C-alpha cells in the first residue's frame, strides 16, 4: 500500500495532540458545588486519585470519578428548579499514550 497522506519523511504530530481535558460536567450543563464540602467533581477526583493513582491508568481513574459523581450526588435546593438534579463529568482525551502517575 502507498498513498499521498502517510509515512512522511519528517515526523510531525498535531499541535493539539497530547491534551487531556477533565471537565466536571457534560457539555451545556451546570456544574454543582456544595457550599461546605466543595464541588462534587473535585471531591471525587481527589478521592479517586488518592485511592488509585498508584494502581490505575489515568483514564480508568477518571472513569471511576464519572461513576462516583453520577451515582453518589444529587442536588438539594429550596428552589424546585434546581432541586434533585444530577451531574456526569466529561473526559475529553486527545492523549496519544496511556498515563500512569507511577513508574
Amino acid at each position: 500500500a502507498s498513498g499521498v497522506d502517510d509515512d512522511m519523511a519528517c515526523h510531525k504530530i498535531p499541535v493539539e495532540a497530547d491534551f487531556l481535558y477533565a471537565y466536571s460536567t457534560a457539555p451545556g450543563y451546570y456544574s454543582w458545588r456544595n457550599s461546605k464540602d466543595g464541588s462534587w467533581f473535585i471531591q471525587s477526583l481527589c478521592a479517586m486519585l488518592k485511592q488509585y493513582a498508584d494502581k490505575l491508568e489515568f483514564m480508568h481513574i477518571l472513569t471511576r470519578v464519572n461513576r462516583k459523581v453520577a451515582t453518589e450526588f444529587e442536588s438539594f435546593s429550596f428552589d424546585a428548579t434546581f432541586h434533585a438534579k444530577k451531574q456526569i463529568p466529561c473526559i475529553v482525551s486527545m492523549l496519544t499514550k496511556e498515563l500512569y502517575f507511577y513508574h
Binding site: 504530530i13 498535531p14 499541535v15 493539539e16 495532540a17 497530547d18 491534551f19 487531556l20 481535558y21 477533565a22 471537565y23 466536571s24 460536567t25 457534560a26 457539555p27 451545556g28 450543563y29 451546570y30 456544574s31 458545588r33 456544595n34 457550599s35 461546605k36 464540602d37 466543595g38 464541588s39 467533581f41 473535585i42 471531591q43 477526583l45 481527589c46 486519585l49 488518592k50 493513582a53 491508568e57 444529587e74 428548579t81 434546581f82 434533585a84 438534579k85 444530577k86 451531574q87 456526569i88 466529561c90 492523549l95 499514550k97 496511556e98 498515563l99 500512569y100 502517575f101 507511577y102 513508574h103
Partner: protein
C-alpha cells in the same frame, strides 16, 4: 535490548511537573458574580492530592482575566525539559468554552494555546492536563431512577 513498546508516557523525568491551581472565590462586584463558597476546600484538597503525586503545586487565588492570561503565558515560557507533564486546575464560574477571571471571562482556548505542541517545545510529546470545575451551560439533568 528487548522489545520496546512505548504505549505509555515517560513519567520518570526528574520532575513530575507543575500543577497550577487557579482558585477564584471572590469576584468583582462590577461583574455581578457571587462568591464560590467551598472552593477553598477544593483548592486545598487538590494541593494535598497532587503534592503526594510529586507535582510542584503552585496556587493562585482570585485572579483577574489579565492575570490568568499572564500567569499561563509565563508558565508556558518556563523550561519544562526536566518535567514529565503539566497540570492546570481551574476553579471558577464558567460557560461553554469559557472560564471567568474575577473581572471577566477568559476563553479556555486562549489559555491552552500557550501549551500547543508548537508553542511550548519543552512539553511537546508530554501530557498536558486541564481540570476544569465550572459550568458549561445552563442545562440541568433531571436524572433517571435506577
Amino acid at each position: 535490548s528487548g522489545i520496546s513498546l512505548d504505549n505509555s508516557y515517560k513519567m520518570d523525568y526528574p520532575e513530575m511537573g507543575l500543577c497550577i491551581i487557579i482558585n477564584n472565590k471572590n469576584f468583582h462586584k462590577s461583574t455581578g458574580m457571587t462568591s464560590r463558597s467551598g472552593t477553598d476546600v477544593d483548592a486545598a484538597n487538590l494541593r494535598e492530592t497532587f503534592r503526594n503525586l510529586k507535582y510542584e503545586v503552585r496556587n493562585k487565588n482570585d485572579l483577574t482575566r489579565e492575570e490568568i492570561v499572564e500567569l499561563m503565558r509565563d508558565v508556558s515560557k518556563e523550561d519544562h525539559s526536566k518535567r514529565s507533564s503539566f497540570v492546570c486546575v481551574l476553579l471558577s464560574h464558567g460557560e461553554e468554552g469559557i472560564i471567568f477571571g474575577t473581572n471577566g471571562p477568559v476563553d479556555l482556548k486562549k489559555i491552552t494555546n500557550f501549551f500547543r505542541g508548537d508553542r511550548c517545545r519543552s512539553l511537546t510529546g508530554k501530557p498536558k492536563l486541564f481540570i476544569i470545575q465550572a459550568c458549561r451551560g445552563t442545562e440541568l439533568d433531571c436524572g433517571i431512577e435506577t
